[PDB]
Amino acid sequence: SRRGRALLAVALNLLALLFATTAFLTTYWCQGTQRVPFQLRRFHTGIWYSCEEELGGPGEKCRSFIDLAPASEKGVLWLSVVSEVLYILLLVVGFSLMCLELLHSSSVIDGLKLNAFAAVFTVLSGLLGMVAHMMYTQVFQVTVSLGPEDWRPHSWDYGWSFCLAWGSFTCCMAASVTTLNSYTK
Amino acid sequence: AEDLSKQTEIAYGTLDSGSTKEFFRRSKIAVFDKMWTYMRSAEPSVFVRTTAEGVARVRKSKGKYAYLLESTMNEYIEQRKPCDTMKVGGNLDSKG
Amino acid sequence: FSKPFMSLGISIMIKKPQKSKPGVFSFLDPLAYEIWMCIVFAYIGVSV
């Protein structure tokens, strides 16, 4: 029994290893479109590089997302990128301690304290992780309005891998309860 | 104009070669003497080249740059596209 | 010259005040800072 509940917390955090890093590498967070005078181009911007598709070619003309942001919201944005690196790191610190939940690892003796430290390493990660997306979105709401130089999207809609960004935070909380109800029963 | 005196967070300037810059140098008003020193003392480049560059700094600096000019130009820029300026305060001196 | 057909003066030009960013603590914009301190002062006293 205790092998299966411990395997479930590792398998969910392995998805949180996948979903949060799939969101972090992709640049498809906000699928916007921009007309020029009627000719609309479709684009997508992530956290680092804003790449728009040119009309009928290779496309992907990539501006860095940093310098286009306004000056007050730029150092606000760095606190999102600092915390997002602090999110992926503390999930790997969380997930590698889930590998010590395996009894093929170290021991039974003081291993139960390793699992009490384990969900804490995922909960204190996900709390910093949810804010790191909340810190991103309120910056992006400004850049639709007034921030950059005269490119303003027709749509500010969240694309894919932003739903994958919440799902890793969802899987961090679903895995932390799996290692804690088996901590009691 | 006394609110541009007691507050140093918002920059304010005139045209580089005009009677308006000539006005604050020869002033003996208590507030207007403080404004002329601040155009010179605390200074990254405050003044602009001509009137159109002064209006263009107002649209760009996002409420951090005020531009002191005539009251007959401060209304027409207000009533023209892209409609991003207003007229605050009263008329300071009188001309004709 | 003739008499002045138009009066004028030196006047300040500033940006149209748009809506800014709403503040980072803009949820407590209705009740001023004299009340949120005094509620906490009255929170402690009624508890004690």
Add this chain to the structure above:
Amino acid sequence: FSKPFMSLGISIMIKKPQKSKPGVFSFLDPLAYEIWMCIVFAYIGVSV
């Protein structure tokens, strides 16, 4: 005449707005005082 040594025009003259003095019991103001008393007398009614 000379040139104008001051410029002037017609301007509006109204009374200065005084202090908006609310009173110490300004919070009771939305409900009329024939409601606030009848809340208390219907409080004793349902309590009985």
Add this chain to the structure above:
Amino acid sequence: VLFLVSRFSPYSTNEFGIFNSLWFSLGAFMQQGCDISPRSLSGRIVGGVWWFFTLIIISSYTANLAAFLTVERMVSPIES
């Protein structure tokens, strides 16, 4: 986080399971409350801060719905 705290030295019998910790928070968010209440200090903070979250969001919901229905009450379509 309320479930995470109540399995440590917050004890006696641990009642705040994950099927109960959702039911306290949903009772706190709809302002109905439940019979259960956190008894340790680290449970009273997570039960305390979430109360201040549901006080602002509900009051922001009622006011903004009073903002739609007042502006819609003032549309006044063209009479002359």
Add this chain to the structure above:
Amino acid sequence: QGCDISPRSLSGRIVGGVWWFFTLIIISSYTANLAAFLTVERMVSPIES
């Protein structure tokens, strides 16, 4: 008015969970719409033709 008796079963808590959201909207719809009457009132004529 928070009742002392609480549901415990899951199908008791889905019923008490959805109904609690029913009261959060309707009481906030009723409070918001009484604001819309006392702020801007529109006195309407009985006849128009």
Add this chain to the structure above:
Amino acid sequence: SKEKTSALSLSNVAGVFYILVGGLGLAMLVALIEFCYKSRA
């Protein structure tokens, strides 16, 4: 004549989530020291 109505954006109530999570990190911090205070006694 150009006025309109608006939904509440995220930035309007953005502070309360930060009071929320900032309340959550303080709830984890006292959970350690109360685990320390109980264990010493």
Add this chain to the structure above:
Amino acid sequence: SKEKTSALSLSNVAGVFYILVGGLGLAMLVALIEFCYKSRAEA
């Protein structure tokens, strides 16, 4: 001329605190009246 308020001030909700401070002062008095009634029975 720069005095302008756009928020709820302490003066608009002042009498609630006056009921609250007045509510505490009548509460501590009755705690003295009840405590003397208990020392009446304990004698």
